[PDB]
Design a protein around this nucleic acid. Structure first.
Ligand SMILES: [Mg+2]
Ligand SMILES: [Mg+2]
Ligand SMILES: [Mg+2]
Ligand SMILES: [Mg+2]
Ligand SMILES: [Mg+2]
Ligand SMILES: [Mg+2]
Ligand SMILES: [Mg+2]
Ligand SMILES: [Mg+2]
Ligand SMILES: [Mg+2]
Ligand SMILES: [Mg+2]
Ligand SMILES: [Mg+2]
Ligand SMILES: [Mg+2]
Ligand SMILES: [Mg+2]
Ligand SMILES: [Mg+2]
Ligand SMILES: [Mg+2]
Ligand SMILES: [Mg+2]
Ligand SMILES: [Mg+2]
Ligand SMILES: [Mg+2]
Ligand SMILES: [Mg+2]
Ligand SMILES: [Mg+2]
Ligand SMILES: [Mg+2]
Ligand SMILES: [Mg+2]
Ligand SMILES: [Mg+2]
Lengths: 105, 143, 64, 229
RNA sequence: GGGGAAACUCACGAGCGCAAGACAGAGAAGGGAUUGACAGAUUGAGAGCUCUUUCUUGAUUCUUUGGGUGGUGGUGCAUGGCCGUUCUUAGUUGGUGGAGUGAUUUGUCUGGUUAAUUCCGUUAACGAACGAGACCUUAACCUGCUAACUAGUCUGCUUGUAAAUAACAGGUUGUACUUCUUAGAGGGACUAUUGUGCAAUAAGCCAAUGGAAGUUUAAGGCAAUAACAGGUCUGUGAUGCCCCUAGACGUGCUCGGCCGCACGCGCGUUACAAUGACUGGCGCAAAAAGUAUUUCCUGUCCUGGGAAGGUACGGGUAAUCUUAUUAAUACCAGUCGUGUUAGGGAUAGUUCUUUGGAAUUGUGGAUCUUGAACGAGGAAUUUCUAGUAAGUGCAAGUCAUCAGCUUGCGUUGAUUAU
């Protein structure tokens, strides 16, 4: 049994989509026999803040726009062979959702 | 399989977090890994003993309570170190004694002070571009 | 300033209007009903409707 | 191992900016067919741009002109003739529900000298017709004279303010060149509530007030008495 | 005016050079249109820039007559777009019906009630549209779920001081656990329960109790109809018109300037000191950030009195590494002892060090001196009801270097109202 510990990383600009991949990746991996999954772990939500003075010309009172971009990173671990992973990654995952993979023994 | 005879109680005050572990013994008091006698504001030290006295050397003498606190400010931590003790002594009696003995001590503390069991709700309040601080603002010349 | 938006009132009114029999004198039980009974988007708003709808229940325990 | 590692922050911000680059690129050149947006799925293998338009036919081009012009044009800034950067044009099912499109329709009518009111009416009627739940049009500018002036035309519902504002509302605005100066044209189409995961109409979540109270249905049944003979 | 200007930026001033004058009509041109250039001579300048000089180069062009580019140049009262204000007040409309010849009105009201055209209810109105709400983000509760070698606890082991055991630190390990931490599902308040005021029934108002949480829970985002000929054409390859056009308001270069001083205003910074200053000791925090090779955060170590150096050993393109810590106020001890003393630190003088081609019209930082007004501030006048004022430091923007500004963060933490 050539077992390979696989690291599934998922980083995304919005929560709607990243939670689907996470939810379904596990849903799908648990259902395979050659599978061992470490629960979907949620890293701390990083927030990029950009505060901007509204108006273009500096007139009128002080108006500030607080803009945010949230980035959720989820991490999943897998006990499988090399084909097993490519079997579970066969989803239909939304755009702008980066998925990185690490293979160790 | 394992199963130590331990209780895990926490206290908090504006970020102050009190990890309080209670095991049965001979009356130990560890705070971040030292004896109460060494807290920073020699003053507030009393605050922490308030629960102890309010109950009686009895309950303290039978057990060994170790607490670790890395809250925010000197004053606040003390409040948590306080809140953990109180919550733990009560928490111990819940699963390791008659549920009735717990009620005794709970009201006991509640009656003297709520800051031992309750949680000081308030935190800080975020600033606003409307001025220099959380609710103050740039001067305003009228005339 | 605890007053009720017209919508909040209409809901409680029409809910009570349709399910009177089923509705209890307990908010929690009723809140559950109201949620199983219709489309209340805001979880919070749901309560308001029930909290008030429940109020009417006790005012009909009067008749007027 | 893709060249350089980058702060998921740093690389994400880069991602967004690139997308906003594409948006100016397309909208500015694809100024003929109803342009809408771009579903961009980037892989260290293939960058897939998917242009959504009211008139997809226009995007592909003639012989395959534009399709290649754009695909190549991209290859010029971030090239990869390895078909890597491949473009696809999606059809915008309900034309009248896309504001980005209607504005262009309006932009066209105005340059063809169709009077304002008459103009807006056609787009607004056409929009509501397509299933809009409320539509509004704004046209600030030197409306047939000296001073500036702002013309407003509204029909049906509309969500002026709230968080749902951006959810049930589509807004696009364009500049219309005149030998006069400029015309501002804003279009606010207010999309219909759609509870079907199997539909591409606008909204999906109900309006926060919009409270329905399904009346009780009807029931009939059987009984299992202990017969008496 | 993201306005913290050394250059740059930059528009302003002195001086100098580049054309990136396309595209067209006509004239010119291989028997040359035209670029380049040693060398002296000129310059601020190895700018052929210019003159003397003569050789390269190939029609990329010259020449006029049109005609463009580009322009932080002019009109915000020609304009888009955006933003400020009225105002976040709570208002604003239209269909049909009613009244008026009409502008107009009723609808949106007499009385209650509410933060609210928010409700009760009234009712010549009835039905409706946008606004407050609703909503969205963040904060406060969950010893119950979901999980966790980029969190932490425990359990069996083992290690150091110790006499051991205790105690305290350290290393491990377990498909162990989640209280702490993370974040995802879902809970939870709705004004609930009780009695006065209201009371017509009411909407609602009060007080008490339970409660993590009752001022619509707190703080914000969003923000209606009109409009201010508010502000920006110097943010915009958004533009109308008008300006400039090669000794140009194009573009670039060198050097100045926007910080110039008799003064008049407006934010602020520090302080007048014993509820203090200085010396020493003391594991308490939060939120932010961070690289293509050394170029970003920087830990360990070495050298300097010191700022700062070195490159000796290293991690990180991040809950893994700078860090779970390097804040400061506070607390204990000591010196000073009312003394414009030094509290206060402006001004100034050598030295040293970092950023940068360059700092001189001090970039910033270190050292020793110098040591001013100031003794709590007139007429006036600004914000401000709770983890709020205040004080106290930390970040982030700008940024090579520069914060006394800004946008956030936490610690210490109250008087008076309601
Ligand atoms: Mg306008
Ligand atoms: Mg200036
Ligand atoms: Mg210049
Ligand atoms: Mg021009
Ligand atoms: Mg321009
Ligand atoms: Mg009428
Ligand atoms: Mg009439
Ligand atoms: Mg009405
Ligand atoms: Mg009125
Ligand atoms: Mg009126
Ligand atoms: Mg009234
Ligand atoms: Mg609010
Ligand atoms: Mg406005
Ligand atoms: Mg402009
Ligand atoms: Mg010039
Ligand atoms: Mg160093
Ligand atoms: Mg740091
Ligand atoms: Mg002295
Ligand atoms: Mg000097
Ligand atoms: Mg200085
Ligand atoms: Mg400060
Ligand atoms: Mg820096
Ligand atoms: Mg800085």
């Amino acid at each position: 049994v050539k077992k390979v510990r696989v690291r599934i990383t998922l980083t995304c600009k919005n929560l709607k989509s990243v939670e689907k991949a996470t939810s379904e990746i596990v849903s799908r991996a648990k259902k395979t026999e050659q599978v061992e999954v470490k629960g979907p772990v949620r890293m701390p939500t990083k927030t990029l803040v950009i505060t901007v003075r509204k108006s273009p010309c500096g007139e009128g009172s002080k108006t500030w726009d607080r803009f945010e971009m949230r980035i959720y990173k989820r991490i999943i671990d897998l006990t499988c062979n090399v084909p097993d992973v490519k079997t579970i990654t066969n989803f239909r995952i939304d755009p702008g959702v980066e998925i990185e993979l690490t293979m160790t023994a | 399989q394992q199963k130590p005879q331990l209780v895990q109680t926490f206290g908090r005050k504006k970020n102050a977090v009190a990890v309080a572990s209670v095991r049965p013994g001979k009356g130990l008091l560890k705070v971040n890994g030292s004896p109460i006698d060494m807290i920073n504001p020699q003053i507030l030290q009393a605050k922490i003993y308030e629960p102890i006295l309010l109950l009686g050397q009895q309950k303290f003498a039978n057990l060994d309570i170790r607490i670790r606190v890395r809250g925010s400010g000197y004053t606040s931590q003390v409040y948590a170190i306080r809140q953990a003790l109180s919550k733990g002594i009560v928490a111990y009696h819940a699963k390791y004694v008659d549920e009735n003995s717990k009620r005794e001590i709970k009201e006991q503390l509640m009656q003297y002070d709520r800051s031992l069991l309750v949680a000081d709700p308030r935190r800080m309040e975020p600033k606003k571009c409307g001025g220099r601080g959380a609710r103050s603002k740039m001067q305003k010349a009228y005339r | 300033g605890r007053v009720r938006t017209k919508t909040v009132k209409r809901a409680a009114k029409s809910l009570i209007e349709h399910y009177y029999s089923k509705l209890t004198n307990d908010f929690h039980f009723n809140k559950k009903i109201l949620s199983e009974v219709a489309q209340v988007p805001s979880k919070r708003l749901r309560n308001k409707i029930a909290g008030f709808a429940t109020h009417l229940m006790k005012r009909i325990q009067k008749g007027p | 191992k893709t060249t350089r590692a980058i702060n998921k922050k740093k690389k994400f911000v880069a991602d967004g900016v690139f997308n906003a680059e594409l948006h100016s690129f397309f909208s500015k050149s694809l100024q003929d067919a109803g342009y809408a947006g771009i579903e961009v799925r980037r892989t260290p293998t293939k960058t897939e741009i998917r242009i959504k338009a009211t008139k997809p036919q226009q995007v592909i081009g003639v012989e395959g002109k534009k399709h290649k012009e754009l695909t190549q044009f991209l290859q010029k800034r971030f090239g990869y003739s390895d078909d890597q950067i491949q473009i696809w044009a999606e059809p915008i099912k309900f034309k009248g529900l896309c504001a980005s499109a209607q504005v262009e329709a309006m932009n066209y009518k105005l340059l063809k000298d169709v009077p304002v009111r008459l103009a807006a009416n056609y787009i607004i009627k056409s929009v509501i017709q397509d299933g809009a739940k409320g539509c509004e049009i704004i046209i600030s500018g030197k409306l047939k004279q000296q001073r500036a002036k702002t013309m407003k035309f509204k029909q049906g519902y509309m969500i002026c303010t709230g968080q749902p504002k951006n959810d049930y509302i589509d807004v696009a605005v364009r500049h219309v060149f005149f030998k006069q100066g400029i015309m501002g044209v804003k279009v606010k189409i207010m999309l219909p509530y759609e509870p079907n995961p199997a539909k591409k109409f606008g909204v999906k979540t109900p309006i926060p007030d919009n409270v329905i109270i399904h009346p009780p249905k009807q029931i009939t049944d059987d009984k299992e008495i202990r017969t008496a003979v």
